[PDB]
Amino acid sequence: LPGECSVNVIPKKNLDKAKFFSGTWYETHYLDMDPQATEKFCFSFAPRESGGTVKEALYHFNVDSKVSFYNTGTGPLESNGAKYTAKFNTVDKKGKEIKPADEKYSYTVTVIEAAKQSALIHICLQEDGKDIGDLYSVLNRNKNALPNKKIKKALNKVSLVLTKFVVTKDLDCKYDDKFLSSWQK
Numbered sequence: 001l002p003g004e005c006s007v008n009v010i011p012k013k014n015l016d017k018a019k020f021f022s023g024t025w026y027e028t029h030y031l032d033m034d035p036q037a038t039e040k041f042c043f044s045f046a047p048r049e050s051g052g053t054v055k056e057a058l059y060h061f062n063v064d065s066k067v068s069f070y071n072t073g074t075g076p077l078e079s080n081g082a083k084y085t086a087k088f089n090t091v092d093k094k095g096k097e098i099k100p101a102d103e104k105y106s107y108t109v110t111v112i113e114a115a116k117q118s119a120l121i122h123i124c125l126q127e128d129g130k131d132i133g134d135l136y137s138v139l140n141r142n143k144n145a146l147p148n149k150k151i152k153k154a155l156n157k158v159s160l161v162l163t164k165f166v167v168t169k170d171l172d173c174k175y176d177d178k179f180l181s182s183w184q185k
């Protein structure tokens with residue numbers, strides 16, 4: 001049911017960490033597993049890893065309200081090298097903290113597949129370690145690009161097809177690319 005995080009979310013075997021945890025990723029397609037979650041959003045992020053800790057900068061844009069928000073997330077990478085659980089705060093466009101982390105919230109990202117300039121991730125949001133909801137996202141290095149077929153193969157294993165996803169390339173997305181490109185610089 002909506003609210004419980006999906007089963008059969010499998011971390012990629014032997015994800016190349018240096019490649020995945022670099023640069024900027026754009027969401028091109030997403031599927032919130034709650035069918036009533038129909039707000040249109042654009043998303044991009046810059047995840048980095050060092051010494052088994054992930055530090056990432058996040059960017060969301062609400063298409064309807066035209067309001068953006070910025071977060072950073074930090075947490076340990078699992079031994080499998082393709083899954084992490086983060087605590088997060090809220091920052092402004094200059095990276096200054098404007099709201100501190102709320103200890104009760106966390107999220108868990110699984111990198112399911114990565115191929116060429118494409119990837120497939122899943123996020124499970126939690127409150128006090130209990131599932132509150134989840135979403136799948138197809139990522140690309142290029143905003144307007146279609147995913148590698150390996151991403152579709154991965155979707156098919158969890159009984160999903162790409163046509164079910166929201167596509168954002170036609171939406172009025174506005175991005176802060178400098179916030180992400182300047183991450184940790």
Ligand code: HEM
Pocket residue numbers: 027029030039041042043045058060069071073088089090107109121123135136137
């Ligand atoms: C890829 C498609 C994604 C979409 C469409 C999306 C959409 C959203 C929406 C609608 C909200 C709630 C905003 C509000 O309450 O007004 C939100 C919040 C949030 N998302 Fe995402 N999200 C995506 C991916 C991600 C990913 C991959 C992460 C983590 C790596 C993430 C981390 C967060 C966090 C931490 C919040 C809470 C921000 C806050 O409360 O200040 N999101 N997202």
